Amino acid sequence: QATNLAANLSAVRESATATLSGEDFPALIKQASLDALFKCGKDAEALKEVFTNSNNVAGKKAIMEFAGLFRSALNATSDSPEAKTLLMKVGAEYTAQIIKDGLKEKSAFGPWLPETKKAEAKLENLEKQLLDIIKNNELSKLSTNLVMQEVMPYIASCIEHNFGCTLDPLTRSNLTHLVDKAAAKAVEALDMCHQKLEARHLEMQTLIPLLLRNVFAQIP
Amino acid sequence: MQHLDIAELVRSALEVSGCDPSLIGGIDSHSTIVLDLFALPSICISVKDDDVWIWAQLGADSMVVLQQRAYEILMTIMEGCHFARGGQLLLGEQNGELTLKALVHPDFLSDGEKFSTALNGFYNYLEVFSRSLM
Amino acid sequence: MQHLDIAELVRSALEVSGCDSTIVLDLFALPSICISVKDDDVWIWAQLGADSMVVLQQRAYEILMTIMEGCHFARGGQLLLGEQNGELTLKALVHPDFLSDGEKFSTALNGFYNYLEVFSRSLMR
């Protein structure tokens, strides 16, 4: 009897259209970091096109940083279904905001990066405090307030100091609700993550930076 | 490798496979030969500077589904392919679609029975890869 | 290709770079790589580490995307993944255009080391 191919053959024809197709190693290495993140999106290729066509230095830097942190989090969350689910969700949310944003001159990505060594240390230090608060704790009113006290000064620092944010100084003085609301969103993200979750502590430690950066990216 | 008539090779392999020879249209222009199939992507056969390639595009959403199924796809690739140079199928991308490709080893180009083994084997992998990307 | 001596081609490739059974090439400041002839095919390959088969599962997509960017000196335009001694391997079936002489083969070797560094970084945890 006929082979499966023969039995399922519908036609044999020729085509003049059907055709096949024919080194920057640092770029290759960078692409592989981005791919780990962009896999979480609806369409990784569409993400790569947005990124590649952007001229927003700070926005691209924010995404690259996130992608690097995402790789670390995948290292630490791959043995727990709750943690990997959390990671995949923050990935999906971040990447969806990339597509919605478009990485033009005015972008949700870039303004909330630390622009001095001091600011970088403040961010690392607050991330470490968040981990202490949560492991000392749903979050209580105490813990909630302590999170607020960690996050609000960082957000306010960015508004005060940053040039990656393109807003006029005088106009930035209208944004007190921005800081309150963003810090509350951070509480909510941390509170939900804590609910869903030594191994756990390492999971939280890698997740905190992503949850925070995703909150920053959702600031209107 | 040089007097090689790909149309005659294909015609002979399909005969070995028990194909209805009436389904075979005009092939002989030394373009890509295309086998259309009942529920699967079409199989393309082409000669590219003395290399014989068999390939198929795997579907409009294959690159997206690949984001979730890359491990299963890699395991499948690593299981090997006896009729391909290097013992392995290759993946590329054509028209925004993932492509499964076999650079056919010349051992499978000597006669129609041998080429039939390659074509039917490719069919089998096409089923498997396309289903893994569903 | 049955006149081809892989031992001499490697010697030549080293000479022309200013340097001094499967061949194991273990040079200063380079990872160990293997060069072998099998059935008229020339392979260059290397193992990628004790837990490379674990990281492969974790980073399959990323690793596959890098493979799909291609490799100009390989048959088929692409590096292959294999497995040896429980470790992932990166393998190049060397295209005959890169087997004609020492200059050409040194370019394949150089290229292999460059790609191996890329894949090593992809597999670090």
Swiss-Prot record, chain A:
Location relative to the cell: Secreted
Subunit relationships: Interacts with human PERP.
Function: Actin-binding protein that interferes with host cell actin cytoskeleton. It stimulates actin polymerization and counteracts F-actin destabilizing proteins. Potentiates SipC activity; both are required for an efficient bacterial internalization. In vitro, forms a complex with host cell protein T-plastin increasing actin bundling. It inhibits ADF/cofilin-directed depolymerization both by preventing binding of ADF and cofilin and by displacing them from F-actin. Also protects F-actin from gelsolin-directed severing and reanneals gelsolin-severed F-actin fragments.
Family as reported in the entry's similarity comment: Belongs to the SipA/IpaA family.
UniProt protein name: Cell invasion protein SipA
Source organism of this protein record: Salmonella typhimurium (strain SL1344)
Gene that this polypeptide is encoded by: sipA
Residue window of the full protein shown: 23 to 262 of 685
From Swiss-Prot, chain B:
InterPro entries: Invas_SpaK
Superkingdom field: Bacteria
Cystines in this chain: none
A Pfam family that the UniProt record links to this protein: Invas_SpaK
Swiss-Prot/TrEMBL keywords: Chaperone, Virulence
Function of the protein: Involved in a secretory pathway responsible for the surface presentation of determinants needed for the entry of Salmonella species into mammalian cells. Chaperone specialized in the storage of effectors within the bacterial cytoplasm, maintaining them in a secretion-competent state, and allowing their immediate delivery to target cells upon contact of the bacterium with the host cells. Has been shown to chaperone SopA, SopE, SopE2 and SipA.
Subunit structure: Homodimer.
Family: Belongs to the SpaK family.
Protein name: Surface presentation of antigens protein SpaK
The species this protein was found in: Salmonella typhimurium (strain LT2 / SGSC1412 / ATCC 700720)
Gene: spaK
